[PDB]
Design a protein around this ligand. Structure first.
Ligand SMILES: Cc1cc(-c2cc(F)c3nnc([C@@H](C)n4ccc5ncccc5c4=O)n3c2)on1
Length: 288
């Protein structure tokens, strides 16, 4: 790595992000995750159980100083509902490996769809509140997620929910839900996107608020696909007919009212993540 190529203020932070190969064993024999940009494997860090992501499906990782800079930013994030970066390990043959905490119970969507798990309505709302707290933190860091959805949050061994799939962990972990734009070629999660982002492909924290509303709907339907009878970019036409996802059977009325505020046609009128934490914690507190 070329320390000179970095912003001079960040050079000190590199030692805290870089993991020496001696400190990490990767078990390439068993894939635990699959993304478009690469596979994920069990690993042991010095005995800390971790998830090691390869980026080898990409032809190139871009500018190495930029990759490092991304890693440094990501490493300073610390919140119990945000997936942390443990570090990055430089291997001789191949791209760098990204080292994340192991998430025993996988992604939130699959967890709520799992027949062997039986969360209550209170539990599902609490999963939503935990996501809201993670997003309030990210928004306070002026970080825009761009791909918030239940598939992109994960659960650890204590069922703590963590906003995942950002920074160096960013990928498409379920290709079904990404559609190619015709003018730009970008693969977009159209069914989670705000109206304005469908039009401009610009994403903001207020478009993350829209996605969060969809995520709440996923939770209360225990992982149903949103808008099944709508096809890809016909979602814009569908929404502009004056439509929204219907209230799920076991979704409390005030929680559906929160969903509708998250889908406000004017981005600036949608609630902040701080407001969502406040409103959801109240609704959650009414359940036993
Ligand atoms: C479906 C699905 C979703 C994911 C997923 C979603 C994320 F938001 C996400 N963020 N980071 C990851 C990768 C790096 N990851 C992280 C931890 C982990 N722990 C246990 C098993 C697999 C993983 C994993 O794939 N993710 C995988 O993997 N399969």
């Amino acid at each position: 790595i070329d320390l000179s190529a970095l912003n001079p203020e960040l050079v000190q932070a590199v030692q805290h992000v870089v993991i020496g190969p001696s400190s990490l064993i990767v078990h390439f024999n068993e894939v635990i995750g699959r993304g478009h940009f690469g596979c994920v494997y069990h690993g042991t860090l010095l005995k800390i159980h971790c998830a090691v992501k390869s980026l080898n499906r990409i032809t190139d990782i871009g500018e190495v100083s930029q990759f490092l800079t991304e890693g440094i930013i990501m490493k300073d994030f610390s919140h119990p509902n945000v997936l942390s970066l443990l570090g990055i390990c430089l291997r001789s043959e191949g791209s760098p490996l990204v080292v994340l905490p192991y998430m025993k119970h996988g992604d939130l969507r699959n967890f709520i769809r799992n027949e062997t798990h039986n969360p209550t309505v209170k539990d599902l709302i609490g999963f939503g509140l935990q996501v809201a707290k993670g997003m309030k933190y990210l928004a306070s860091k002026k970080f825009v997620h761009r791909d918030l959805a239940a598939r992109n949050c994960m659960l650890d061994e204590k069922f703590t929910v963590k906003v995942a799939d950002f920074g160096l962990a960013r990928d498409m972990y379920d290709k079904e839900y990404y559609s190619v734009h015709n003018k730009t070629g970008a693969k977009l999660p159209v069914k989670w996107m705000a109206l304005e982002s469908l039009q401009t492909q610009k994403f903001t924290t207020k478009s993350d608020v829209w996605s969060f509303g969809v995520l709440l709907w996923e939770l209360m339907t225990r992982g149903a696909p949103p808008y099944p009878d709508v096809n890809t970019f016909d979602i814009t036409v569908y929404l502009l007919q004056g439509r929204r996802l219907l209230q799920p059977e076991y979704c409390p009325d005030p929680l559906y009212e929160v969903m509708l505020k998250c889908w406000h046609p004017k981005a600036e009128m949608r609630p902040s993540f701080s407001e969502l934490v406040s409103r959801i914690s109240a609704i959650f507190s009414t359940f036993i």
